[PDB]
Amino acid sequence: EYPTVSEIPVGEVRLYQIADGVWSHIATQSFDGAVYPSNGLIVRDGDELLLIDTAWGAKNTAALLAEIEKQIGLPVTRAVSTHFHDDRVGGVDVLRAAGVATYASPSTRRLAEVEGNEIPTHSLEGLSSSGDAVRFGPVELFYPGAAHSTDNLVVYVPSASVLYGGCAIYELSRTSAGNVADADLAEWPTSIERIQQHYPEAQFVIPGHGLPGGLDLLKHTTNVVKAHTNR
Ligand SMILES: [Zn+2]
Ligand SMILES: [Zn+2]
Ligand SMILES: [Zn+2]
């Protein structure tokens, strides 16, 4: 069964195997006196690994690298951050010092700089217009349009039919909108429909926080966003 907060204390990281050569990584962080979980992805690319997102902070990200070497034993050579917030880029400096090449879209890199957050080194081309997709090793990267943030990317693993939605997709147990200070509420439902149109065959869907499910998570997120819009 999928790990939850009660089973992970801050500073530790769990790995969960989704399919052959595809794992999620789960970590926790405190904020405002509550404890929140957070997901990223690991995908095998021959004899190397691609990482999607940090584990939300420098200490957690060092623990993530140690857990990968203990449990998988292959080198992490590249990492992609899916938007500019600290649960996605916090820990980029640890990755860089370990020899991992770090990547994000130019939009993400600019917004991280304005915020004073850590800045991935390399710029991903071909993702500036809504509906754009590019291949990056064993995954496809897709820019659906503005949603949780103006820069948010989603990631698809074709060999395993795994769709990683990041923070643009909510878990089923979340019934109210989360942090929306940087969101585009007007465009978020349209961006979700672009994901459904491009990846209708997805079998596993991973939100940025909480439990995986199926494609139902997309309509669920639209329902929650529209209710918040009508507040
Ligand atoms: Zn975010
Ligand atoms: Zn998030
Ligand atoms: Zn729902």
Tab-separated table of C-alpha atoms and ligand atoms in Angstrom:
chain	number	residue	atom	x	y	z
A	1	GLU	CA	0.000	0.000	0.000
A	2	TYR	CA	1.054	3.557	-0.699
A	3	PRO	CA	2.930	5.351	2.128
A	4	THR	CA	1.270	8.171	4.098
A	5	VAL	CA	2.467	10.794	6.614
A	6	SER	CA	2.081	8.729	9.786
A	7	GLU	CA	4.629	6.330	8.261
A	8	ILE	CA	7.248	8.923	7.195
A	9	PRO	CA	8.837	11.449	9.580
A	10	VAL	CA	10.395	14.588	8.152
A	11	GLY	CA	13.940	13.955	6.993
A	12	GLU	CA	13.217	10.421	5.727
A	13	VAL	CA	12.159	9.342	2.238
A	14	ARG	CA	10.266	6.311	0.907
A	15	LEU	CA	10.337	4.805	-2.594
A	16	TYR	CA	7.296	3.062	-4.139
A	17	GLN	CA	7.634	0.892	-7.272
A	18	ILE	CA	4.783	1.652	-9.716
A	19	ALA	CA	5.958	-0.452	-12.667
A	20	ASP	CA	9.151	-1.960	-14.033
A	21	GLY	CA	11.699	0.853	-13.894
A	22	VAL	CA	9.256	3.475	-12.526
A	23	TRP	CA	9.085	4.574	-8.874
A	24	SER	CA	7.563	7.442	-6.966
A	25	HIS	CA	9.460	9.126	-4.096
A	26	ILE	CA	7.565	10.318	-1.009
A	27	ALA	CA	8.751	12.784	1.648
A	28	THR	CA	7.176	15.045	4.266
A	29	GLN	CA	7.504	18.623	5.439
A	30	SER	CA	5.978	20.744	8.180
A	31	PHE	CA	4.179	23.978	7.366
A	32	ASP	CA	2.008	26.081	9.693
A	33	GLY	CA	1.928	23.326	12.325
A	34	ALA	CA	0.580	20.569	10.038
A	35	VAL	CA	2.490	17.812	8.236
A	36	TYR	CA	2.136	17.387	4.480
A	37	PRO	CA	3.401	14.682	2.107
A	38	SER	CA	4.875	15.282	-1.340
A	39	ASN	CA	5.511	13.073	-4.410
A	40	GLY	CA	8.091	12.984	-7.199
A	41	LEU	CA	9.144	10.361	-9.814
A	42	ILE	CA	12.187	8.203	-10.728
A	43	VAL	CA	12.452	6.596	-14.184
A	44	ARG	CA	15.099	4.147	-15.374
A	45	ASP	CA	16.927	5.166	-18.575
A	46	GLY	CA	19.168	2.271	-19.478
A	47	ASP	CA	21.835	2.022	-16.780
A	48	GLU	CA	21.076	5.516	-15.376
A	49	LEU	CA	18.133	7.238	-13.661
A	50	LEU	CA	16.062	10.350	-14.417
A	51	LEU	CA	14.635	12.207	-11.358
A	52	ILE	CA	11.409	14.282	-11.520
A	53	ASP	CA	11.312	16.939	-8.731
A	54	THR	CA	13.292	17.311	-5.472
A	55	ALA	CA	12.051	15.939	-2.113
A	56	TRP	CA	11.140	19.403	-0.771
A	57	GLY	CA	14.319	20.755	0.857
A	58	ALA	CA	18.057	20.144	1.098
A	59	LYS	CA	17.956	17.618	3.960
A	60	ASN	CA	15.150	15.576	2.367
A	61	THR	CA	16.895	15.646	-1.039
A	62	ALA	CA	20.173	14.338	0.431
A	63	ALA	CA	18.118	11.552	2.065
A	64	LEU	CA	16.512	10.831	-1.339
A	65	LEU	CA	19.910	10.389	-3.025
A	66	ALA	CA	21.034	8.074	-0.193
A	67	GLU	CA	17.840	5.980	-0.440
A	68	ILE	CA	18.191	5.624	-4.237
A	69	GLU	CA	21.787	4.402	-3.912
A	70	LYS	CA	20.817	1.941	-1.159
A	71	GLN	CA	17.697	0.538	-2.862
A	72	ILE	CA	18.276	0.902	-6.636
A	73	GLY	CA	22.045	1.349	-6.995
A	74	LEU	CA	22.117	3.212	-10.329
A	75	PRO	CA	23.349	6.812	-10.808
A	76	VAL	CA	20.966	9.774	-11.015
A	77	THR	CA	22.348	11.677	-13.993
A	78	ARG	CA	19.566	14.205	-14.761
A	79	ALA	CA	16.705	15.906	-12.884
A	80	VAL	CA	13.666	17.967	-14.070
A	81	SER	CA	11.717	20.419	-11.857
A	82	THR	CA	8.043	20.767	-12.898
A	83	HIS	CA	7.448	24.288	-11.467
A	84	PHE	CA	9.237	27.005	-9.466
A	85	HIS	CA	7.973	26.290	-5.859
A	86	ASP	CA	10.213	24.869	-3.056
A	87	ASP	CA	8.629	21.369	-3.144
A	88	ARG	CA	9.997	21.113	-6.705
A	89	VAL	CA	13.317	23.104	-6.717
A	90	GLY	CA	14.288	23.103	-3.014
A	91	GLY	CA	17.303	20.790	-3.012
A	92	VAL	CA	18.535	21.662	-6.518
A	93	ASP	CA	21.836	22.857	-4.974
A	94	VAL	CA	22.349	19.431	-3.308
A	95	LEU	CA	21.669	17.701	-6.673
A	96	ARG	CA	24.158	19.965	-8.469
A	97	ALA	CA	26.924	19.361	-5.904
A	98	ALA	CA	26.392	15.587	-6.357
A	99	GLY	CA	26.985	15.839	-10.134
A	100	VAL	CA	23.334	15.674	-11.268
A	101	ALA	CA	22.485	17.895	-14.270
A	102	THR	CA	19.381	19.967	-13.319
A	103	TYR	CA	16.749	21.138	-15.848
A	104	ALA	CA	13.602	23.295	-16.023
A	105	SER	CA	11.737	25.395	-18.590
A	106	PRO	CA	12.919	28.999	-19.072
A	107	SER	CA	9.623	30.136	-17.513
A	108	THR	CA	10.314	28.091	-14.360
A	109	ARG	CA	13.916	29.358	-14.150
A	110	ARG	CA	12.776	33.008	-14.361
A	111	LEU	CA	10.027	32.611	-11.735
A	112	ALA	CA	12.431	30.786	-9.336
A	113	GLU	CA	14.893	33.692	-9.633
A	114	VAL	CA	12.211	36.321	-8.891
A	115	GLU	CA	11.158	34.286	-5.827
A	116	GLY	CA	14.719	33.851	-4.524
A	117	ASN	CA	14.450	30.058	-4.855
A	118	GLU	CA	17.098	27.638	-6.149
A	119	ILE	CA	17.525	27.746	-9.952
A	120	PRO	CA	17.978	24.618	-12.151
A	121	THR	CA	21.055	24.987	-14.403
A	122	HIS	CA	19.792	23.892	-17.859
A	123	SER	CA	16.880	25.280	-19.903
A	124	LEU	CA	14.327	22.984	-21.609
A	125	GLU	CA	13.297	24.177	-25.081
A	126	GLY	CA	10.064	23.499	-26.932
A	127	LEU	CA	7.608	23.980	-24.026
A	128	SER	CA	6.550	27.643	-24.280
A	129	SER	CA	3.025	27.252	-25.783
A	130	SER	CA	0.050	25.426	-24.281
A	131	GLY	CA	-0.183	21.946	-25.779
A	132	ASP	CA	3.578	21.635	-26.478
A	133	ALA	CA	5.337	18.308	-25.833
A	134	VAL	CA	8.963	17.114	-26.044
A	135	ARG	CA	10.718	13.800	-25.432
A	136	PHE	CA	13.361	13.815	-22.649
A	137	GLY	CA	15.033	10.430	-22.326
A	138	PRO	CA	12.450	7.833	-21.208
A	139	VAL	CA	9.611	10.376	-20.635
A	140	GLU	CA	7.502	12.951	-22.474
A	141	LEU	CA	7.292	16.450	-20.950
A	142	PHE	CA	4.020	18.379	-21.609
A	143	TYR	CA	3.066	22.027	-20.938
A	144	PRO	CA	-0.763	22.013	-20.596
A	145	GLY	CA	-1.206	25.729	-19.922
A	146	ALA	CA	-1.417	27.695	-16.683
A	147	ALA	CA	-3.029	25.927	-13.703
A	148	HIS	CA	-1.543	25.618	-10.175
A	149	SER	CA	1.176	27.951	-11.553
A	150	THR	CA	1.807	29.618	-14.940
A	151	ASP	CA	4.855	27.347	-15.603
A	152	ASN	CA	3.581	23.922	-14.464
A	153	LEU	CA	4.668	20.846	-16.502
A	154	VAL	CA	3.302	17.281	-16.513
A	155	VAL	CA	5.336	14.101	-17.237
A	156	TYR	CA	4.256	10.885	-19.036
A	157	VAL	CA	6.092	7.543	-19.047
A	158	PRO	CA	4.903	5.737	-22.221
A	159	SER	CA	6.390	2.321	-21.402
A	160	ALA	CA	4.327	2.104	-18.183
A	161	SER	CA	1.274	4.336	-18.930
A	162	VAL	CA	2.131	6.510	-15.878
A	163	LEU	CA	1.033	10.169	-15.812
A	164	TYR	CA	2.702	12.395	-13.199
A	165	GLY	CA	0.522	15.480	-12.794
A	166	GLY	CA	2.482	17.374	-10.213
A	167	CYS	CA	0.696	20.089	-8.247
A	168	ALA	CA	-1.762	20.836	-11.102
A	169	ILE	CA	-3.565	17.592	-10.106
A	170	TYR	CA	-5.196	17.044	-6.674
A	171	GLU	CA	-5.666	13.747	-4.806
A	172	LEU	CA	-9.261	12.550	-4.265
A	173	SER	CA	-9.253	13.210	-0.488
A	174	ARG	CA	-8.550	16.933	-1.068
A	175	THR	CA	-11.940	18.654	-1.316
A	176	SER	CA	-10.931	22.331	-1.070
A	177	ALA	CA	-8.449	24.346	-3.093
A	178	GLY	CA	-4.967	24.451	-1.651
A	179	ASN	CA	-2.402	27.176	-2.184
A	180	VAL	CA	-3.623	29.192	-5.154
A	181	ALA	CA	-1.671	32.450	-4.726
A	182	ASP	CA	0.255	31.784	-7.970
A	183	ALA	CA	-2.561	29.980	-9.828
A	184	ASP	CA	-4.562	30.856	-12.953
A	185	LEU	CA	-8.033	29.802	-11.808
A	186	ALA	CA	-9.638	30.938	-15.101
A	187	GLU	CA	-7.400	28.691	-17.238
A	188	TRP	CA	-6.925	25.684	-14.912
A	189	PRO	CA	-9.941	23.632	-16.191
A	190	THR	CA	-8.926	24.220	-19.843
A	191	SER	CA	-5.345	23.103	-19.048
A	192	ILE	CA	-6.686	19.896	-17.441
A	193	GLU	CA	-8.760	19.160	-20.564
A	194	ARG	CA	-5.545	19.394	-22.644
A	195	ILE	CA	-4.013	16.668	-20.407
A	196	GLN	CA	-7.054	14.404	-20.884
A	197	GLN	CA	-6.952	14.925	-24.681
A	198	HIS	CA	-3.221	14.125	-24.952
A	199	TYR	CA	-3.004	11.156	-22.484
A	200	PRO	CA	-6.379	9.324	-22.615
A	201	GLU	CA	-4.606	5.945	-22.257
A	202	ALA	CA	-2.984	6.766	-18.882
A	203	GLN	CA	-3.492	3.948	-16.335
A	204	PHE	CA	-1.806	5.459	-13.247
A	205	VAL	CA	-2.114	9.135	-12.272
A	206	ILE	CA	0.171	10.615	-9.573
A	207	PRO	CA	-0.782	13.960	-7.902
A	208	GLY	CA	1.825	16.321	-6.481
A	209	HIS	CA	0.625	15.507	-2.920
A	210	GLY	CA	-1.154	12.319	-1.727
A	211	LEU	CA	-2.492	9.043	-3.103
A	212	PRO	CA	-2.288	7.951	-6.765
A	213	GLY	CA	-5.378	6.964	-8.723
A	214	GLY	CA	-6.754	6.869	-12.251
A	215	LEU	CA	-7.847	9.504	-14.747
A	216	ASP	CA	-10.782	10.394	-12.424
A	217	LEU	CA	-8.278	12.638	-10.577
A	218	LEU	CA	-8.466	15.109	-13.505
A	219	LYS	CA	-12.228	15.680	-13.299
A	220	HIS	CA	-11.943	15.725	-9.492
A	221	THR	CA	-9.437	18.608	-9.680
A	222	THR	CA	-11.675	20.526	-12.104
A	223	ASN	CA	-14.616	20.143	-9.704
A	224	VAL	CA	-12.580	21.526	-6.756
A	225	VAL	CA	-11.197	24.464	-8.809
A	226	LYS	CA	-14.635	25.435	-10.144
A	227	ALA	CA	-16.126	25.370	-6.622
A	228	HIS	CA	-13.353	27.674	-5.399
A	229	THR	CA	-13.910	29.990	-8.409
A	230	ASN	CA	-17.539	30.364	-7.303
A	231	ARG	CA	-16.694	31.190	-3.659
B	1	ZN	ZN	3.435	24.615	-6.171
B	2	ZN	ZN	3.038	21.209	-4.433
B	3	ZN	ZN	-14.104	14.461	-6.635
